[PDB]
């Protein structure tokens, strides 16, 4: 991991970056802040290019659409808690998701949003903002304290609270047992496997393929090709980022950056990893984060 850039928040005695993602214009990173600002930075020069107030509480999460026309945000204690913003021409609010603490785009065709409210997943039409679908069954719930509902790559399955759902029928196919209190899990990009904390399950059989103890409590991100997997413990859930070969799950690196981690993300070309680190302790009067960019390839 070769350091390529470092940069804080401009003109802030206390730098308050909390999350990050690559924009559709490579060279430029979008960051959320502890004051609910969305900022655009040149990721090499550290130059702040634009700023908008999205929320009156901290940003926890953001996701740009691929086509560069839309942005999803989630805040901490704001009503509404999550929103969808338009970025074509002018920056403006399209829809709000009143109590959803987390939101993502669909994957294969980006025409829907999936939101989470405690144990319950909500699917929404992007163009109308309607709720199309509520996925919740009280007799299959795991009650994961960090539950984050997510589409599979083809947009026809959802994982919510450790339960696999088939969208077209709105039927629960399978409930994976509970083995931790917090983490509800993600689809592998290959479409064949699910990662729920330290368990990797096959979607053919529901048989355990791998135990990866090092993944305990970790959020997970993939490079664009789906061949490398990064994991870290995140602040929004509460210094070691791990990297794994995404086919066999054997470790490639264990970095200790010496600093608690707020977020990590990949570019579309498998070239860069961007990480938000705090230089402060948690017991400090104030936050002091940096964004670090690493060459990987
Ligand atoms: F949005 C959240 C609200 C509460 C707890 C965690 C998250 C969250 C989930 C996530 C999943 C995969 C990759 C990155 C992330 C992430 N980055 C910042 C915080 N965050
Ligand atoms: F304001 C922003 C806040 C956060 C992220 C991006 C922007 C932004 C920067 C921009 C730069 C040059 C030309 C047009 C634009 C623009 N039009 C709408 C969105 N947007
Ligand atoms: F295996 C099952 C037994 C009973 C019910 C469903 C399945 C199943 C779910 C699935 C989900 C995503 C990708 C592939 C699959 C799959 N491939 C074969 C079987 N199968």
Swiss-Prot record:
Ubiquitously expressed. WD repeats lie at residues 12-51, 54-95, 97-134, 136-168, 169-211. A motif (DWD box 1) lies at residues 163-170. Induction: Up-regulated in a number of cancer cell lines (at protein level). It is found in: Cytoplasm; Nucleus; Cytoplasm, Cytoskeleton, Microtubule organizing center, Centrosome. Coiled coil: none annotated. Residues 12-211 are annotated as: WD repeat-like region. Belongs to the VPRBP/DCAF1 family. The protein kinase-like region mediates the threonine-protein kinase activity. The DWD boxes are required for interaction with DDB1. Acts both as a substrate recognition component of E3 ubiquitin-protein ligase complexes and as an atypical serine/threonine-protein kinase, playing key roles in various processes such as cell cycle, telomerase regulation and histone modification. Probable substrate-specific adapter of a DCX (DDB1-CUL4-X-box) E3 ubiquitin-protein ligase complex, named CUL4A-RBX1-DDB1-DCAF1/VPRBP complex, which mediates ubiquitination and proteasome-dependent degradation of proteins such as NF2. (Microbial infection) In case of infection by HIV-1 virus, it is recruited by HIV-1 Vpr in order to hijack the CUL4A-RBX1-DDB1-DCAF1/VPRBP function leading to arrest the cell cycle in G2 phase, and also to protect the viral protein from proteasomal degradation by another E3 ubiquitin ligase. The HIV-1 Vpr protein hijacks the CUL4A-RBX1-DDB1-DCAF1/VPRBP complex to promote ubiquitination and degradation of proteins such as TERT and ZIP/ZGPAT. Component of the DCX (DDB1-CUL4-X-box) E3 ubiquitin-protein ligase complex, named CUL4A-RBX1-DDB1-DCAF1/VPRBP complex. Interacts with DDB1; the interaction is direct. Also forms a ternary complex with DDA1 and DDB1. Interacts with NF2 (via FERM domain). Component of the EDVP complex, a E3 ligase complex containing DYRK2, EDD/UBR5, DDB1 and DCAF1. Interacts with DYRK2; the interaction is direct. Interacts with RAG1; the interaction is direct. Interacts with LLGL1 and LLGL2. Interacts with histone H3. (Microbial infection) Interacts with HIV-1 virus Vpr protein; the interaction is direct. This is DDB1- and CUL4-associated factor 1. The gene is DCAF1. The chain holds residues 1080 to 1390 of 1507 of the full protein.
